[PDB]
Amino acid sequence: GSMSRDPLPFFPPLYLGGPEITTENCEREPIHIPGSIQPHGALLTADGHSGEVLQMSLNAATFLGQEPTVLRGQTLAALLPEQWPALQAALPPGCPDALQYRATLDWPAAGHLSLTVHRVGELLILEFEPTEATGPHALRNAMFALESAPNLRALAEVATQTVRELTGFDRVMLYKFAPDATGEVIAEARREGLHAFLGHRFPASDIPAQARALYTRHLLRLTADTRAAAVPLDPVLNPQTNAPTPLGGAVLRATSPMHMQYLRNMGVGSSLSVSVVVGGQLWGLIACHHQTPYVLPPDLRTTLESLGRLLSLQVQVKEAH
Amino acid sequence: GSMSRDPLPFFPPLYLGGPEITTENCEREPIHIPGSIQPHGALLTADGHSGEVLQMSLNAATFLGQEPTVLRGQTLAALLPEQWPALQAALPPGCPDALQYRATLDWPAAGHLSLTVHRVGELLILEFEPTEATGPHALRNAMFALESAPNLRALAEVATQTVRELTGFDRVMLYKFAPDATGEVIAEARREGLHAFLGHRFPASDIPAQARALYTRHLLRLTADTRAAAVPLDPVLNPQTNAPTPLGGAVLRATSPMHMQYLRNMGVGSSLSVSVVVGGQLWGLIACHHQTPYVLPPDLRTTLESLGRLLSLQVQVKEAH
Numbered sequence A, B: 001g002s003m004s005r006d007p008l009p010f011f012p013p014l015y016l017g018g019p020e021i022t023t024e025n026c027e028r029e030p031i032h033i034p035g036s037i038q039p040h041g042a043l044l045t046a047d048g049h050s051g052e053v054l055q056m057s058l059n060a061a062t063f064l065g066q067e068p069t070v071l072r073g074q075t076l077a078a079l080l081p082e083q084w085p086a087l088q089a090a091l092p093p094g095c096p097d098a099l100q101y102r103a104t105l106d107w108p109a110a111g112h113l114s115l116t117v118h119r120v121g122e123l124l125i126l127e128f129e130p131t132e133a134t135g136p137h138a139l140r141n142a143m144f145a146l147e148s149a150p151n152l153r154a155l156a157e158v159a160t161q162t163v164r165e166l167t168g169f170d171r172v173m174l175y176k177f178a179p180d181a182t183g184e185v186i187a188e189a190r191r192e193g194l195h196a197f198l199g200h201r202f203p204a205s206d207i208p209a210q211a212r213a214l215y216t217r218h219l220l221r222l223t224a225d226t227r228a229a230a231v232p233l234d235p236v237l238n239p240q241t242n243a244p245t246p247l248g249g250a251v252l253r254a255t256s257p258m259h260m261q262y263l264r265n266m267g268v269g270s271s272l273s274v275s276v277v278v279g280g281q282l283w284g285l286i287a288c289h290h291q292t293p294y295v296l297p298p299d300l301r302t303t304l305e306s307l308g309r310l311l312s313l314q315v316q317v318k319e320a321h
């Protein structure tokens, strides 16, 4: 009912005995601490000073080639001797939780592993994703058509078409929030034949207050496969704190099951969105759908994040005119 | 004497019998058509429809492994069968002259060749640069400190420090133009011990009107080695037009000898700048120096171009506040 209102406090998650989430209580789902990840990658956590590996996703062996039990308790100084110093330097204590370190690692299988790391408090969160063998050059050519737009609607149209051209997604929308937190599709690029959502409005409840809050802090999130089961972290609690591990800054964070059902009800196989944040407030989303499961590659997600940040400034300039 | 005044018409270049350039006539130097390039890369031009190679820099054999005479008149369809279709698709007739196609080619020597192409009228201009084996990820982490700046001066300071950290340049300045076209160093990041230019002002003549005009169209230029002799194009005129080839959109464009002397007088071995363009007007430059010759890698130059575009929007937002 309002973009400026605080979200409600969260319930405990399910693995700490919290309540099942229904349409009556879903604003209280603790979406940032699901204790699990999407299965197209693996996640480890590690102490930010010692590098000791503290938690691992149960599927870690598939991606890393070693079982969860042997890797646990080993240090990153030993495991990643080539990356550990760089990672430390990049993510010092107290850095922003949205700051990332990225590297590409070689692995027995085809392509590489992409490694993305961020810091929350005293914890480092490491995401591993298979990638095949996008420059900053993409973003460069894409800024030109955005800078040439004559007004806010024209900017919206070209930004959505640009994102579609870059990603190949079946649908790319610009969804703009109103002050009552309802939202509206103001531009859409879509594959020929797909039903249009352009000009449609949706209730505030479709993107609940705690999601909107999270999306003001961590600007990109996705569901690669709307039918894929989440993979638990083990142990599920961070041993540093004996409390849940915040996963808001990890793209591999498991998506709310309530939203997964919403996406399936729409016939969506894969979803991704990027926040448009203007003057520190959530202005809208670049919201993308695919008809089938799709893993957008790491570097492309970063181009889209940067683009999201470009678009926010372009909007802020134009709204001031 | 004014940022809004038109530049004077240019003299013919030296190779068409134009006058020698002195401090009395230097606003008329045709800097965009020097008929030559910097020697750290090679350049070819080609017909935009047929792909026939029309001009080549005299050093082309060093980079391409084949002498200028045999490659001339061959088509890109034959020479670059893997890139020619993509290049065509990327740079259609009538596209912006600042739009670029980039690819990496393998060559007998160490590393690769970077290929950058743009279109001017019916001509494609191909630049080849050796590069060793930067993600969009650089630009991403760099936007954070810029978005956090509390005012225009703070933004200037962090942007210059960011560019220095990304590039390793000995000096990075933000130079801001006044309405009379004089300019002023408003932020500076520099190696310990180097003499400060912070807060210094310079006459309009140091960046003459035709340079300022060019820099409003083509947002990055450089001199990799301030003592290096230029390499002619052959033939020097575009056969399509029997007229000079515009090189404003090619980083390999030879720098004005007058500016090269200026840089040497400052003890500068390498220079690079990026335009900051606000509301279509040249607001300032991110101006970089190195004490010794330096070739900033292609992808890093693009990150800096994008950053330049980021900074311009951030300035435009703040000036509106």
Ligand SMILES: C=CC1=C(C)/C(=C/C2=[NH+]C(=C\c3[nH]c(/C=C4\NC(=O)[C@@H](C)\C4=C/C)c(C)c3CCC(=O)O)/C(CCC(=O)O)=C2C)NC1=O
Pocket: A022, A023, A024, A025, A026, A027, A029, A031, A185, A197, A202, A205, A206, A207, A208, A211, A221, A222, A223, A254, A255, A256, A258, A259, A262, A271, A272, A273, A285, A287, A288
């Ligand atoms: C064409 C119109 C259109 C709309 C309006 C739309 C909405 C949308 N919801 C999103 C997220 C969430 N929604 C809910 C919860 C509820 N949603 C409901 O309807 C009720 C039943 C409910 C609870 C009672 C939760 C917990 C999240 C957080 C998920 C997470 O990050 O873990 C996102 C962002 C993520 C993404 O891009 O995929 C989008 C873009 N997507 C469209 O295509």
Ligand SMILES: C=CC1=C(C)/C(=C/C2=[NH+]C(=C\c3[nH]c(/C=C4\NC(=O)[C@@H](C)\C4=C/C)c(C)c3CCC(=O)O)/C(CCC(=O)O)=C2C)NC1=O
Pocket: B022, B023, B024, B025, B026, B027, B029, B031, B185, B197, B202, B205, B206, B207, B208, B211, B221, B222, B223, B254, B255, B256, B258, B259, B262, B271, B272, B273, B285, B287, B288
């Ligand atoms: C610390 C202060 C400081 C200043 C003020 C500064 C100036 C500067 N001049 C630039 C360019 C040019 N200047 C001139 C000509 C003349 N210059 C003069 O003084 C008189 C003698 C003269 C003619 C009579 C021409 C033709 C060009 C175009 C070159 C080209 O693109 O081919 C550039 C951009 C290029 C770059 O980043 O390296 C910069 C940043 N660079 C600094 O570091």
Ligand SMILES: [Cl-]
Pocket: A032, A246, A247, A248, A249
């Ligand atoms: Cl979080």
Ligand SMILES: [Cl-]
Pocket: B032, B246, B247, B248, B249
């Ligand atoms: Cl030109």
